Design an enzyme around this catalytic site. Structure first.
Site, PDB file in Angstrom:
ATOM      1  N   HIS A   1       4.513   5.500  18.037  1.00 22.17           N
ATOM      2  CA  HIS A   1       5.967   5.581  17.914  1.00 22.17           C
ATOM      3  C   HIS A   1       6.552   4.414  18.700  1.00 22.17           C
ATOM      4  O   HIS A   1       6.743   4.480  19.915  1.00 22.17           O
ATOM      5  CB  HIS A   1       6.478   6.934  18.385  1.00 22.17           C
ATOM      6  CG  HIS A   1       5.762   8.090  17.761  1.00 22.17           C
ATOM      7  ND1 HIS A   1       5.189   9.101  18.500  1.00 22.17           N
ATOM      8  CD2 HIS A   1       5.518   8.388  16.463  1.00 22.17           C
ATOM      9  CE1 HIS A   1       4.630   9.978  17.684  1.00 22.17           C
ATOM     10  NE2 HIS A   1       4.813   9.567  16.442  1.00 22.17           N
TER      11      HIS A   1
HETATM   12  C1  LIG Z   1      -1.556   6.492  12.778  1.00 14.72           C
HETATM   13  C2  LIG Z   1      -0.058   6.650  12.750  1.00 14.72           C
HETATM   14  C3  LIG Z   1       0.494   7.926  12.711  1.00 14.72           C
HETATM   15  C4  LIG Z   1       1.874   8.108  12.683  1.00 14.72           C
HETATM   16  N1  LIG Z   1       2.372   9.399  12.643  1.00 14.72           N
HETATM   17  C5  LIG Z   1       3.663   9.554  12.618  1.00 14.72           C
HETATM   18  C6  LIG Z   1       4.184  10.905  12.576  1.00 14.72           C
HETATM   19  O1  LIG Z   1       3.515  11.936  12.560  1.00 14.72           O
HETATM   20  N2  LIG Z   1       5.559  10.968  12.548  1.00 14.72           N
HETATM   21  C7  LIG Z   1       6.429   9.890  12.564  1.00 14.72           C
HETATM   22  O2  LIG Z   1       7.645  10.106  12.538  1.00 14.72           O
HETATM   23  N3  LIG Z   1       5.928   8.622  12.605  1.00 14.72           N
HETATM   24  C8  LIG Z   1       4.616   8.474  12.631  1.00 14.72           C
HETATM   25  N4  LIG Z   1       4.106   7.201  12.673  1.00 14.72           N
HETATM   26  C9  LIG Z   1       5.042   6.069  12.678  1.00 14.72           C
HETATM   27  C10 LIG Z   1       5.523   5.692  11.281  1.00 14.72           C
HETATM   28  O3  LIG Z   1       4.433   5.711  10.357  1.00 14.72           O
HETATM   29  C11 LIG Z   1       6.132   4.291  11.319  1.00 14.72           C
HETATM   30  O4  LIG Z   1       6.592   4.019  12.638  1.00 14.72           O
HETATM   31  C12 LIG Z   1       7.292   4.099  10.342  1.00 14.72           C
HETATM   32  O5  LIG Z   1       6.779   3.661   9.083  1.00 14.72           O
HETATM   33  C13 LIG Z   1       8.333   3.131  10.859  1.00 14.72           C
HETATM   34  O6  LIG Z   1       7.943   1.788  10.501  1.00 14.72           O
HETATM   35  P1  LIG Z   1       9.017   0.705  10.105  1.00 14.72           P
HETATM   36  O7  LIG Z   1       9.655   1.064   8.760  1.00 14.72           O
HETATM   37  O8  LIG Z   1       9.980   0.530  11.221  1.00 14.72           O
HETATM   38  O9  LIG Z   1       8.155  -0.620   9.919  1.00 14.72           O
HETATM   39  P2  LIG Z   1       7.320  -1.037   8.636  1.00 14.72           P
HETATM   40  O10 LIG Z   1       7.931  -0.456   7.418  1.00 14.72           O
HETATM   41  O11 LIG Z   1       5.864  -0.628   8.877  1.00 14.72           O
HETATM   42  O12 LIG Z   1       7.432  -2.613   8.629  1.00 14.72           O
HETATM   43  C14 LIG Z   1       8.572  -3.278   8.045  1.00 14.72           C
HETATM   44  C15 LIG Z   1       8.164  -4.624   7.500  1.00 14.72           C
HETATM   45  O13 LIG Z   1       8.649  -5.668   8.359  1.00 14.72           O
HETATM   46  C16 LIG Z   1       7.924  -6.827   8.035  1.00 14.72           C
HETATM   47  N5  LIG Z   1       8.017  -7.763   9.153  1.00 14.72           N
HETATM   48  C17 LIG Z   1       7.616  -7.554  10.446  1.00 14.72           C
HETATM   49  N6  LIG Z   1       7.819  -8.578  11.242  1.00 14.72           N
HETATM   50  C18 LIG Z   1       8.397  -9.527  10.412  1.00 14.72           C
HETATM   51  C19 LIG Z   1       8.854 -10.839  10.644  1.00 14.72           C
HETATM   52  N7  LIG Z   1       8.799 -11.447  11.834  1.00 14.72           N
HETATM   53  N8  LIG Z   1       9.375 -11.515   9.599  1.00 14.72           N
HETATM   54  C20 LIG Z   1       9.432 -10.915   8.407  1.00 14.72           C
HETATM   55  N9  LIG Z   1       9.034  -9.686   8.068  1.00 14.72           N
HETATM   56  C21 LIG Z   1       8.523  -9.039   9.122  1.00 14.72           C
HETATM   57  C22 LIG Z   1       6.499  -6.367   7.710  1.00 14.72           C
HETATM   58  O14 LIG Z   1       5.985  -7.095   6.600  1.00 14.72           O
HETATM   59  C23 LIG Z   1       6.661  -4.869   7.390  1.00 14.72           C
HETATM   60  O15 LIG Z   1       6.194  -4.554   6.083  1.00 14.72           O
HETATM   61  C24 LIG Z   1       2.713   6.984  12.699  1.00 14.72           C
HETATM   62  C25 LIG Z   1       2.167   5.708  12.739  1.00 14.72           C
HETATM   63  C26 LIG Z   1       0.787   5.529  12.767  1.00 14.72           C
HETATM   64  C27 LIG Z   1       0.220   4.138  12.809  1.00 14.72           C
END
Ligand SMILES: Cc1cc2nc3c(=O)[nH]c(=O)nc-3n(C[C@H](O)[C@H](O)[C@H](O)COP(=O)(O)OP(=O)(O)OC[C@H]3O[C@@H](n4cnc5c(N)ncnc54)[C@H](O)[C@@H]3O)c2cc1C
Ligand SMILES: COC1=C(OC)C(=O)C(C/C=C(\C)CC/C=C(\C)CC/C=C(\C)CC/C=C(\C)CC/C=C(\C)CC/C=C(\C)CC/C=C(\C)CC/C=C(\C)CC/C=C(\C)CCC=C(C)C)=C(C)C1=O
Ligand code: HEC
Ligand code: HEC
Ligand code: HEC
Ligand code: F3S
Lengths: 413, 136, 540
Positions: C476
């Site tokens: 997280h």
């Molecule tokens: C094993 C595991 C278990 C989990 N379990 C849970 C759970 O039970 N409950 C829960 O609520 N959460 C859980 N999480 C967390 C959750 O899966 C993620 O945190 C959630 O998808 C949020 O990710 P995000 O959308 O912020 O980023 P993402 O969607 O993963 O990333 C956004 C995008 O940004 C792009 N990006 C990054 N840096 C740059 C840059 N400099 N320039 C351009 N593009 C860039 C990347 O290409 C990426 O695709 C878990 C995570 C893991 C790893």
């Protein structure tokens, strides 16, 4: 419930005059993808301003059976008035009473259908009506058979209008009566042969199988999909059991009609005990956004192994149908199979919702290219159902475009 | 063929389960001879041992071959038939899934992860007891 | 690529960016989602996991199905790519996994969408510890609900389980029935005095949106082959369907500010290291709790030598997560894991209380992932043969129990995300490096959570009792972009807008001023749509 409400439920007037789950019921506005284009259903609620609340009994009967509105214009054949013409006068007045006394008025104009020239004007339709031989003496009790036979005929031809889809249309899109209940392409979907043919039709189906298919649409050998999904979830699942018994009694008596290239019933195909090779995807590891996996087995296991097992016999509890010995895959025409792959299956029966996902370009599960449909359907057809048919890119792209284009549609160019 | 036929025979004796997929066997033997050149000699020796000593089951065979040089090969072929893999790295090749032998003794209750069991709501039912060997 | 100009440029095409783009394109604006990685397919991720050797099914490895691209490397902790260097005595607590592509980590996420307590937004106002948010939960309630409806989330509609997050309009699904193991856990810890509750899962208990209902494949971790749970790909393609532009392989590395500190353009690299510039009226970062501060520090301008929106020196600082200790053991009675989803229940009795002024509140949850692969591997471990092999396989797959206990960490400025001066990638970007300290708060919390786990093992009578001496990663990624009203002690405000740049909003994981005690991605979606409404007010 009231006689008129039951008659409307049996006649399935609600499915075509409702615009989906939303679009308050019997306000029309639902588009039928006719060969000429989108035909918008009219609002049927007794609204004095935008509805048919000003309709009287004679005009209602005329619109219901012969296709003339109050103004005097003709109704497009998309209204099944050609089969709806044969209800008796008690039935039409019952529907009158049900419409004005049991459905709430709604003050919302339905979209007006705009057809391409020369179909833009809805006045030449009288020539088609007289050429189609629609009239049409109202129904009478045939005393040669028993009461259940006559009742089943009444539901089939008059209320449920099976011949609207299961009887092929001639050149003028008129009901070609000669091939009675022999199936036709109704767009992206195909209604199959349902006559008493033991191989082409449903003649070999057991009585309990037909009863379960008509009441729920789910059995070990066939699942209602597409037009049957809507028809069963809107008309037959609420319809009482005795009338289902009359329907199956009549379907067991209709004369037979054979299809080309059939030898066994569409549910009588054995499955090849073949599967994919697990090792082959080792070369496909670290290889996201699949484009290179072209083998039929590898795609089949990639998308379809979860629900239908690698053996192609489906779920033990029966929720996932047995693809082996299933009519959709066992039909010679893969239009049911291709349409199932493209659109999935959605059928709500007893507030319980069958749904198999679509695999067209707008899928949310796995939007996969047309060639992938073709190869997958080829594998499914050869290995588990009827191996004598083929599925190509052109056929699936055609069904994506909305079924094969009837020649008449070329006149609108 | 003869190598592969003796291969599936030795695997049937070692695993103790008569129903084994033939493609999985041929492919496992291919990977096995890829890893070591002299796998055929070892399998002929193992079959000779089981025939001459008249070992009825693999249990007594393993008990009587705890220190001989041919124990590791038997253990590893059993490992390949069950687990479906031969190496111990994270990039090893998987040669059989949904037919690998570890998932069979718990097939009726524990669902094979990417293949659906009976219906979308089966787990409402109580499971089978642990003391009964289902099949296979 | 000449300009790729748009009304709004929002970066990171995950659930954050996909939901933001869908809400913005539903109102008729021009939107540019960008992502650092290429596209992927659900069926291919399924097949890659299908052919992945069961040794990494024994110990939970979810990543190798998803390839790693050299330009945009994502973390793998089976054999490590050294992408995320983590230091400090509690380094192992931060071994966070991510995936880059169309869907992000949310491509493979466990679908545990959760709501925070109102108290979680005023911890220092309630306990004098942690930090307070720039707003309250009542402000975020309607956004949170619209996210729940959009994703298609199941929930325990009618139950007075524990003092928890209030709800205004109920849940568009009912939770699927427990498997055997969840019922056993519930009863045994009801005897133990712990309150086990259903997890709310963004899955299909019935067909919805046009996706079939969950089949209990127990492979939500990492990927279902049915699409019965929510993914960010849904909102991504939905936004694409309304005309929004997406770009894969777009790795942002630089940005430009005018005399008013407003962002005029940013600059990204393609895989071929070609620099392309993008100009827009609105600039918003929605990437990650590690990626966003990385980008902020990477393009430190002449106007911002220390980093973008780092006038308070708080970019990447105050790094939050849930310190967890995960347990595996063999049950005396059969537990029969593998029924339904991968997580269905958790203990939420200790999510709040007056003890929060002294030590951290903890969440004890259970893993419903199938133990069959672990059972087979462990049975083959001692080289057991014959029928006894199958008996051991069956007892190990019927008696394997997996628990975990996560904590809450307070904001520590020393918890930092320095850019590595020793490692670099295909594009030359300095690889992320974190330094984590768990704190005396979490140490005291773990001193009690450990006793709780000893009791949970003893009361049910496990054998082979295995305990890790360190903290496990709970992934997280919160903190680094702290909220607040004072520009000198925060980066962004209640509307996610940066203090230094009125044009820059940050819809990132690092936004959360506190880590809380439960899953917090649904809070992230609520924040993303709040930022969407803020952008709507700004541009209309
Ligand atoms: C094993 C595991 C278990 C989990 N379990 C849970 C759970 O039970 N409950 C829960 O609520 N959460 C859980 N999480 C967390 C959750 O899966 C993620 O945190 C959630 O998808 C949020 O990710 P995000 O959308 O912020 O980023 P993402 O969607 O993963 O990333 C956004 C995008 O940004 C792009 N990006 C990054 N840096 C740059 C840059 N400099 N320039 C351009 N593009 C860039 C990347 O290409 C990426 O695709 C878990 C995570 C893991 C790893
Ligand atoms: C303008 O001049 C000309 C005429 O008049 C001198 C004509 O007569 C004709 C001949 C053509 C017609 C008048 C036919 C008119 C009919 C339509 C516009 C559409 C017909 C629609 C159907 C027959 C619907 C049947 C299809 C079904 C039931 C599919 C099932 C639907 C669901 C599942 C729902 C032409 C071409 C013409 O040029
Ligand atoms: C009046 C109540 C009837 C009856 C008794 C039947 N039909 Fe239909 N049906 C339609 C379509 C497109 C299909 C094929 C679906 C597919 O290809 O997967 C069917 C299927 C059937 C069957 C199953 C027989 C088989 O070979 O699979 C049977 C027994 C059957 N029908 C009988 C579409 C329609 C309609 C579209 C407007 C109409 C009306 C009806 N059917 C009406 C009836
Ligand atoms: C979806 C197939 C369908 C069925 C089944 C159906 N209708 Fe319709 N109805 C239509 C279509 C299409 C039109 C307009 C066709 C046209 O304009 O030529 C129409 C028109 C009408 C009209 C003329 C009203 C107007 O403003 O044009 C009336 C009245 C009517 N239908 C009554 C009924 C009744 C009663 C039933 C018995 C349930 C019924 N319909 C069943 C599709 C259907
Ligand atoms: C679990 C989601 C699911 C997926 C994915 C799926 N199926 Fe099915 N399929 C079903 C269900 C469920 C039914 C029957 C619906 C019912 O009984 O309520 C069905 C029905 C069908 C039918 C029509 C049967 C009939 O009588 O109309 C065909 C054909 C079919 N499946 C083939 C396939 C093929 C080929 C694939 C893969 C390319 C596939 N399915 C993928 C669940 C699925
Ligand atoms: S793998 Fe799929 S079938 Fe359900 S248990 Fe997870 S969403």
């Amino acid at each position: 419930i009231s006689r008129g409400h039951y008659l409307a439920i049996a006649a399935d007037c609600a499915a075509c005059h409702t615009n989906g789950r939303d679009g308050q019921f019997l306000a029309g506005g639902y588009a039928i993808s006719s060969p000429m284009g989108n035909i918008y259903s009219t609002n049927i609620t007794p609204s004095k301003t935008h509805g048919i609340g000003n309709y009287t009994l004679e005009q209602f009967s005329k619109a219901l059976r012969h296709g003339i509105r109050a103004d005097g214009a003709q109704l497009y054949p998309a209204m099944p008035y050609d089969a709806y013409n044969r209800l008796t006068d008690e039935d039409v007045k019952s529907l009158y009473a049900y419409i004005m006394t049991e459905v709430k008025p709604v003050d919302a104009p339905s979209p007006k259908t705009q057809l391409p020239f020369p179909f833009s004007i809805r006045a030449s339709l009288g020539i088609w009506k007289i050429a189609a031989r629609i009239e049409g003496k109202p129904y009478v009790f045939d005393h040669t058979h028993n009461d259940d036979w006559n009742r089943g005929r009444y539901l089939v031809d008059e209320l449920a209008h099976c011949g609207e889809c299961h009887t092929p249309r001639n050149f003028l899109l008129a009901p070609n009566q000669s091939a009675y209940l022999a199936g036709a392409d109704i767009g992206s979907w195909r209604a199959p042969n349902i006559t008493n043919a033991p191989q082409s039709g449903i003649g070999s189906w057991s009585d309990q199988d037909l009863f379960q298919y008509l009441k729920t649409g789910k059995t070990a050998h066939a699942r209602a999909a597409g037009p049957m999904a809507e028809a069963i979830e809107h008309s037959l699942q609420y319809l009482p059991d005795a009338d289902i018994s009359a329907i199956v009694t009549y379907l067991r008596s209709v004369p037979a009609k054979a299809e080309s290239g059939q030898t066994v019933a569409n549910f009588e195909h054995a499955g090849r005990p073949s599967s994919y090779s697990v090792a082959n995807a080792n070369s496909r590891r670290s290889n996201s956004t699949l484009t290179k996996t072209t083998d039929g087995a590898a795609l089949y296991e990639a998308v379809c192994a979860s629900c239908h097992q690698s053996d192609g016999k489906g779920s033990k509890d029966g929720y996932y149908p047995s693809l082996v010995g299933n009519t959709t895959t066992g039909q010679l025409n893969p239009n049911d199979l291709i349409a199932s792959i493209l659109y999935g299956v959605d059928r709500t029966t007893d507030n319980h919702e069958i749904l198999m996902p679509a695999f067209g370009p707008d899928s949310l599960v796995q939007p996969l290219t047309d060639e992938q449909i073709a190869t997958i359907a080829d594998y499914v057809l050869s290995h588990f159902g009827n191996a004598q048919a083929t599925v190509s890119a052109d056929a699936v792209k055609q069904v994506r475009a909305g079924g094969k284009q009837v020649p008449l549609a070329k006149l609108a160019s | 063929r003869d190598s592969i036929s003796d291969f599936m025979q030795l695997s049937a004796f070692a695993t103790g389960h008569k129903n084994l997929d033939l493609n999985i066997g041929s492919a496992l033997l291919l990977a096995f001879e890829a890893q070591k050149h002299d796998f055929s000699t070892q399998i002929k020796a193992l079959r000779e041992h089981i025939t001459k000593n008249n070992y009825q089951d693999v249990e007594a065979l393993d008990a009587a071959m705890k220190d001989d040089p041919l124990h590791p090969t038997l253990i590893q072929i059993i490992r390949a038939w069950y687990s479906g893999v031969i190496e111990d790295e994270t990039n090893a090749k998987v040669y059989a899934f949904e037919k690998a032998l570890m998932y069979q003794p718990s097939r009726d209750v524990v669902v094979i992860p990417t293949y659906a069991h009976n219906g979308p709501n089966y787990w409402v039912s109580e499971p089978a007891s642990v003391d009964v060997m289902p099949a296979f | 690529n000449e300009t790729l100009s748009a009304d709004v440029v929002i970066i990171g095409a995950g659930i954050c960016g996909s939901l933001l783009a869908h809400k913005l394109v539903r109102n008729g604006l021009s939107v540019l989602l960008l992502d650092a990685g290429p596209r992927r397919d659900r069926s291919q991720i399924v097949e890659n996991w299908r052919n992945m050797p069961p040794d990494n099914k024994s110990q939970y490895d979810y990543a190798t199905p998803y390839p790693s691209v050299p330009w945009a490397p994502h973390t793998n902790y089976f054999p490590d790519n050294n992408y995320l260097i983590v230091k400090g005595p509690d380094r192992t607590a931060y071994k966070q996994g991510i995936i880059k592509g169309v869907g992000g980590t949310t491509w493979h996420w466990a679908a545990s969408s959760w709501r925070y307590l109102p108290n979680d937004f005023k911890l220092h106002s309630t306990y004098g510890v942690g930090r307070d948010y720039a707003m309250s939960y009542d402000e975020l309630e309607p956004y949170y609900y619209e996210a729940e409806c959009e994703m298609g989330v199941m929930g325990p509609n009618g139950e007075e389980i524990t003092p928890s997050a209030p709800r205004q309009n109920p849940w568009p699904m009912t939770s699927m029935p427990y498997g055997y193991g969840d019922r056993t856990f519930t009863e045994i810890v009801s005897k133990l005095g712990f309150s086990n509750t259903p997890v709310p899962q963004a899955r299909n208990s019935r067909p919805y949106d046009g996706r079939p209902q969950c089949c209990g494949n127990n492979n939500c971790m990492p990927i279902c082959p049915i699409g019965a749970m929510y993914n960010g790909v849904y909102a991504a393609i939905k936004a694409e369907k309304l005309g929004a532009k997406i770009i894969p392989n777009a790795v942002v590395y630089a940005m430009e500010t005018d005399a008013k500190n407003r962002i005029t353009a940013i600059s990204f690299y393609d895989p071929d290291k070609q620099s392309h510039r993008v100009v827009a009226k609105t600039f918003v970062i929605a990437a990650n709790g590690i990626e966003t501060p990385k980008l902020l520090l990477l393009a430190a301008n002449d106007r911002n030598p220390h980093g973008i929106a780092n006038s308070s020196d708080l970019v990447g600082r105050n790094m939050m997560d849930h310190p967890g200790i995960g347990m595996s053991f063999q049950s005396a009675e059969p537990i029969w894991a593998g029924g339904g989803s991968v997580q269905m229940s958790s203990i939420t009795n200790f999510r709040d209380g007056d003890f929060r002024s002294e030590y951290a509140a903890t969440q004890i949850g259970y893993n419903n992932t199938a133990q069959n692969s672990r059972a087979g591997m462990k049975a083959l471990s001692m080289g057991l043969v014959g029928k006894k092999l199958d008996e051991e396989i069956r007892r190990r797959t019927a008696h394997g129990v997996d628990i975990y206990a996560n904590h809450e960490v307070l904001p520590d400025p020393n918890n930092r995300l320095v850019l590595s001066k020793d490692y670099k990638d295909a594009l030359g970007i300095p690889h992320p490096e974190v330094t984590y300290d768990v704190g005396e708060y979490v140490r005291k919390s773990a001193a009690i959570s450990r006793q709780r786990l000893m009791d949970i093992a003893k009361a049910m009578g496990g054998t082979e009792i295995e305990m890790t001496p360190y903290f496990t990663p709970n992934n997280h990624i919160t903190g680094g972009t702290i909220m607040g009203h004072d520009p000198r002690d925060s980066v962004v405000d209640k509307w996610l807008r940066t203090h230094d740049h009125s044009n820059l909003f940050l819809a990132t994981g690092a936004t959360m001023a506190a880590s809380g005690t439960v899953a917090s991605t649904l809070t992230m979606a609520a924040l993303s749509l709040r930022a969407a409404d803020a952008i709507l007010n700004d541009l209309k």
